[PDB]
C-alpha cells in the first residue's frame, strides 16, 4: 500500500502493471511468452499464455519479422513496426532490457507520419533551441512552440537546483487556468526513482490519470525470480501517489521531455492537458531526439556561463592579492569597499578583523563568534547556516574575515499533494536557511585566506 | 557549352535535367503536368504529358493523396510517401518551389526504415557532435563515425577561409587510396552558385558521376517563360565540369553534408566512392537534421572561441595603454618585447618610431615606406600586400608604429581539374600574399593609435 511515509521508497520501475491504452507482452531470449498484460484478450485476439510462442495468426508477420531481428540481433534492441491487428491499427514498440524482450502494443490513429513530416517536426522544434544564447530565453521559447505543436493545454519548464528542488521558469497555457511561473517544490516531490528514471527515459506519457490500471501476470519472472523491470517501458504504469496529485490539480493527462546535464536531471518540460491526451509514438520519438539536442545545447551554454563567473571571480581575488602583496595598509587596501572583501563572495554583509581593529561593512558580534570558536581554537575556516542577527556565516583565519547571508530569500486524501501545499512545505526547509555556501564560496574564502597568509609587511 | 572560362557563371540551378536513378514530374499549382523527365515511361509506365493530370491508375492513390494535401496546402510544401508502382517500390519525394510542384520518384531498394531505426541513426551521429568542445576534435570524430554509418570509402571535412578558399582538415579513408589531409583548393573550385546551393540544401547526393543525364521537357516552363528551378530538387543534375573532375579523381559517387554559420558555408563533409553509390531518402533525412544540429553546435563554439581571442586581445591593448600612459618612458614601455606592441597583432616583426629613435624588434623597408606615403602626407593609417623583404605592412601614426608579415605561409581532359592540380593553381595566387590583415587587426592598430593619440606626457 502507498502512503506519504512510503512514497520516498516506492519501486515505480517494477510495478507489475501498465496503462490501458496499450498492451504488453514480455518474452524471453528465445521468444517464449513469459507474461502478458491482462487486456491482451480485450485489445487483441490472442490469449498470451506463458509457454506459448507468438504466431503469424496472432500478431502478424510484421511483428514476428521485427521480433526476429531482435532475437538474433546482438546489442540492446529497439524497434517498431506499424501493423494491422484485427480490431485496430497498431504501433508495436519493442525493446530488450535485462534479459527480457518487451512488446508494447499501443493504439494507432491514422495516418502514417511521412518520414518527411517527421523530420520537420524535429527540425521545427530544434530550430527553436538554437536561436538564443541566454538559458532563460531558450527555455522560454521552446516552452511556447511545444504547445503550438502538441496542443497541450499547458506546457511548462522546470529548473532543478543543486539541493534537488524545483522552480517553474517558463510557461504557455490556456488562460482559463492559473499561472504557475515562480512556483517552488521540494526534492521530496520527485523520489530518487522517478528522477533516476527521467534521466533514463527522455520522454514520459500519461494518458488518463484516473485510468484504472492493467496488471501483468505473472507479477514475477520465473527465469529470474524477480519482478519485471519496466524501466524502459513506454506504457509502464504511473504511481498512485502522483495520480492523487495530478487529480488534486485537476489534470487528466501528462507528458515529460527531459533535460539532462552532467549525469543529472537539470530540468524538464512537463506538458499538461485538462482532458485525456495521447501523443503518437512517432511524434514522441521526434521529441525524444529533441531532448538529446536540447540537453547538449544547455550543457555547453551553462558551462560557458559558469566558467565565466568562475573567472571574473578568480580574476577578482588575484586582483586583490596583487593589490595587497604590493600594498601597505592591508586594512585599507582590503577596504575601499568596492575593492573589498564583500566584493569577492556573494553576501549581504561582511567583516575584516585583524589586530584590535574591525569594520562592519554593509565589531561586537566579532567577540562573540571568536568566542564560539573558543572550543575549536585551531580552526582556520568556519561555515554554517540556520544560526545573533544572521544565519549564514563563513569565517577564515590569518586576524580573521567573515561573510554573512541572512534569510529573507523570497479533493485529495493526503495533505501535501497540492501545488500550493508543496510550496508551503518548501518554506519550512528554507525559513532557517540562508543561500548555502557553494563549492566555490568555500574555495574562494580558502584561496583568499592562503593569499593573505603570504603577506609579511 | 561548358569550359574553364564558363565554369564560374554556369547556372547549375536550372540545368533542365536530372540524374537517371529516379524520375521527375513538375506540375503547376493545380496539378496539371507541366513537364517531366524523359525517363518516366522507362522507369514508371506513364507518359506524363503537359496538360495531363495524374490519375490513380499510374501513380497510385498514395501519391495523389500526398499531392492533394500539397495543392490544398498553404505554405512551402515538403513531403513524401513510400508507394509501389508497377515495376518497383518507390520513394516519392515532393516539394513546391517558386510556383511549381516537383514530384521526384527515386527507386527504393531496401526494407522500410522503422521510425525507430531512423531515430537511432539520427541520435547515433548527433551524439558524436556533442562529445567535444574543440572544433577540430568535433570534425575528426564525426568524420569517422560517418564512414562507419554510410560505408562511403572516403569521407572528408572541409573548412573555408575568409577568402572562401578551402582546406581538408579531417579525413577517413580506405587505405588503398591516397591521403588528403592539409590539402588546399581555391574559391574558384566552388562557384558562388554551387556554394549558394550547398547553403540552401543540407545534402547533395551524386549517384553515378559518368551517368549520362536525363532531360526534362519542355526545357522551359510555359507559365513563366523561364526555366525550372531545381534547387531543392534531389535528383537535380551535376555540372559536367565537376563530373570530369570527380572522374579525374577516380570517383564515381558522392554525397555532401553542409555546415552553415552566419548565412555562410563554413565547411562541409564530402563523401566519396570509387564505385557507384546511393543513400536512401530517409537516411539522407537523418543526416539532413544532423546537419542542422551540427551547424548550430559549430556556430556557438566558434563565436565563443572568437569572443575569447577578441578579449585576451583587447585586454592586452588596455593593459598596454595603462602602462604607457602611466609611465614616462614610452619608448621603453611600448617596445618591451613582452609589453610589446608586437604582442597585440599577430606578426613576424614590428617597429616603434618617435622622434629620431627607432627599434627593429623581431627597419630598412621602413625608410622606403615612409617615402611611399610622401605622396599621401595626411594618412594616419596604412595596410598592404603583396609588396623590400616583407610583404605584409600595417602602419599607424601618432611618431609611427609598424607591423610586418612575411609570407612563408605553408588521367584528365581539362588543364586544372585535379586534387594536386588545383593546389598548384592555388599557390600562384597566394605566394605574394601574406596572411591577410584580419578585420580584427585593423581594429586593434586603430584603437591603439587612438589610445596613444592620448598620451600628453
Ligand atoms: C513521496 C512521493 C511523491 C510526492 C511527495 C509527490 O509530490 N509526488 C510524488 C511521486 C511522483 N512525482 C512524480 C513526478 C513529479 N512530481 C512533481 C512535483 C510537483 N510539485 C509541485 O508543486 C507541482 C506542481 C505545482 C508538481 C508537479 C513534479 C513536477 C513531477 C514531474 C512530472 C510533472 O511535472 O507532472 C513522479 C513521476 C511519475 C511518473 O510519471 O512516472 C512520481 C512517482
Ligand atoms: C569553375 C567551376 C569549377 C571548377 C574550377 C572546379 O574545379 N569545379 C567546378 C564546378 C563544381 N565544383 C563543385 C564542387 C566542388 N568542387 C570542389 C573542388 C576541389 N578542390 C580540390 O582540391 C578537390 C579535391 C582534392 C576538390 C573536389 C569541391 C571540393 C567540391 C565540393 C564537393 C566535393 O567535395 O566532392 C560543384 C558542385 C556540384 C554539385 O554537386 O552540384 C560544381 C558545380
Swiss-Prot record, chains A, B:
One of its GO terms (molecular function) is photoreceptor activity. Its EC number is 2.7.13.3. It catalyses: ATP + protein L-histidine = ADP + protein N-phospho-L-histidine. It comes from the Bacteria. Keywords: ATP-binding, Chromophore, Kinase, Nucleotide-binding, Phosphoprotein, Photoreceptor protein, Receptor, Sensory transduction, Transferase. In the N-terminal section; belongs to the phytochrome family. This is Bacteriophytochrome. The lineage of its organism: Bacteria, Pseudomonadati, Pseudomonadota, Gammaproteobacteria, Pseudomonadales. The gene is bphP.
